[model samples]
Target: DFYVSDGSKFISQDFYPKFSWESTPEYAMFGNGASLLTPKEVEKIAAKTDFICIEKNHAYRTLEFAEIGAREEIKNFKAIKPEIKALYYFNSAYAWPFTSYNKNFKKNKIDDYPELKKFILVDKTTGELQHRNNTLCFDVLNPEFRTWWVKTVAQGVKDSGADGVFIDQMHGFVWLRSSQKEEVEKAMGEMMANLKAAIGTNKILLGNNASSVKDVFPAIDAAMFEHYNNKKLSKENLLKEWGDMLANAKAGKMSIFRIGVEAEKEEASQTLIKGSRGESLEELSKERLEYYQACFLIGAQPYSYFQYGWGWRLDTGPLVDYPELQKPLGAPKGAYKRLHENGWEFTREFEHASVWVDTEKKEAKIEWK
Candidate 1:
């Protein structure tokens, strides 16, 4: 079903209210049901949110996340269970973003590939070398290679108590350095088939930022679309794109298509806005908080790319807003209050209508009397 939602960063950072403002009662009502993502600096704005995104796997399988890895972090996340929704790591392309620091596996000696062991075994053995030379990814078409990935990811999820998986780099299957598109597809198809088989088809699995894969969308639970959104579009345009994507996914009985609406770096929580194109580093979370609210109010699925909780500046205090509905820092002028109040309302409203069919179209002409 289509949902008006944001990614898990809000809760991961503890962005909530300690007191009531105009909609104080509503804030509390939602807060009670909400999950503050451990001690990430903020919290999910409301309770009715169905799931939270936990980063179990990423470029590196390092057990460094304070909440998911450390006992203290998990202890702090007493409110929300991690099962709601989480981003499990399965990056088939690059083994480690910082290969030097990765602790998952050592660079084992070369093993022969039955098919191309003759010409490519050496190249496959030192992938770091190959990457430096700008070569294509090692052969994932091989069954043994794919099987290992499935086993590793499955074990990681089981250990972390994660119920779902967001398969990052599913898009790497397409649009890469190789000229052989067909070859890429074949290898990727085998990889995904084995991955689905390993993780079970019924499990919560999502694909992220995939450039092109019309064939595989049917197999996955959800498709996270980044191209469909931008800060330039108004709320109306955002809804239209959202409706189109959500309709297609739900029509096929797939899970919701989560879309990332870029929040203003200045206003959104640090985790939500952090390190993007220069906007404002002051605190425009209010603006960001509202932009997302508007999307949901008009019926759009939301996801955020921000990781590491709120921005770097405002990182303390009870995860709540001020009593006067005032901007805590240099929040955008009007967007602050609007984002908080309206974001809360949207959260409640959308949570109620999550499973219901939404027929209203932002583009449909209205016959005014």
Candidate 2:
């Protein structure tokens, strides 16, 4: 029952046809499936996973992408991989103007939708719209905005040939004032509920960090633990992640553990695993594979998936040949054991490996059988 194979299926900003579809991962994010590729290429990526998520930017990439919409992209991907359940990506709180849907929405300019512009969050001090990477933030508290967003999400999924919607930026509330946080949380509950009602029961509503916030938890069928890794994680955080994993599993929800493999110096989307470091990013990732793998095996229950990548844009981590990932890892014997509750140490046994970790030491080993 271990969801052994989980990964982010994205590589964006540009197209890379060099994909590793030979060893099929069971669940994938397909974060950049909208990027143009040959039908054969699409099939190779799509046919492998049981479920996947196609990121926004349909007809994305270079000039080659202009002819298609993300709906067209999803339509094409699904045609060949008929059984693969795909989700469309939609950032719930940000008005990112990088989608095929928008191309059909008046020159694809966020400005074109003057109604949407009314909902853009403003910096209280500057009286200017807040921006992240030049993308405007949407005020979810605005009922009108939420209504439009929910409608847009539902339509986007249907138009894009997706079986569900992958809602990003669930944690975007963190950027707002603590004073508005409570109201935003309450509004998110309504927004998410409205999203589900609008989308209907047939489609999936997946959220990033959906479980971390109590309000949004009920509406989502899946949640992602973005940026999970040795560098960013603490022992207590690891345990909490495990608990979240269990909660999702108990509720029959899915979890994706996206473990980042890049260093502090590398650009988020840079695919250069071979860097100036003493060891390449790929080299570092390979060296620590067991630790991450062990951490996953210790916590993962059914419906949990694992993904390792530098960034969603150029996430070549999943394509790299890692001998450890293909090993015969069986289901967990049981939940993990704490060496002692007070310190950061734990152990778990699987059918094919004995897992151990010391969060305080940031070390782990998976003795594969």
lDDT of each: 0.36, 0.65
lDDT by residue for model 1 (1-369), tens: 112233211111122112111121111111111222334442532232333343322212343431234222223333454423443444565543222212322234223333323222134355443443333243454466566666766665555545445566654434433676776666666666556677744455556643236545555555444333344244444445445544432333222323222332233334533344223322343233333333432333222211111221122112435222221211111111122432322122322221111122212211111
- Give one digit per residue, the lDDT tens place, for model 2 in 1-369: 433223222221111111222221345554453355566656655544556666555446643332234566567766776656667788877665666434423324656667667877878899767887766777887888888788878777776667787788765455676778888888888899889888856677888878777998988877888764444466777788888887777676777777766533444325543454324666667766777777776777666677664555324453455667667666666778889959888898777778898878768887877
Give the clashing pairs for model 2: 6-306, 12-313
Q: What is the lDDT of residue 27 in candidate 1?
A: 12
State every prediction's TM-score relative to the real structure: 0.51, 0.81
Worst 10-residue lDDT window for candidate 1 reads 24-33
Q: Which stretches of candidate 2 lie over 4 Å from their true place?
A: 2-26, 30-34, 38-48, 62-69, 100-112, 172-174, 228-232, 263-279
Worst 10 residues of 2 by lDDT: 9-18
Candidate 2, residue 271: lDDT? 54
lDDT of 2 at 247: 75
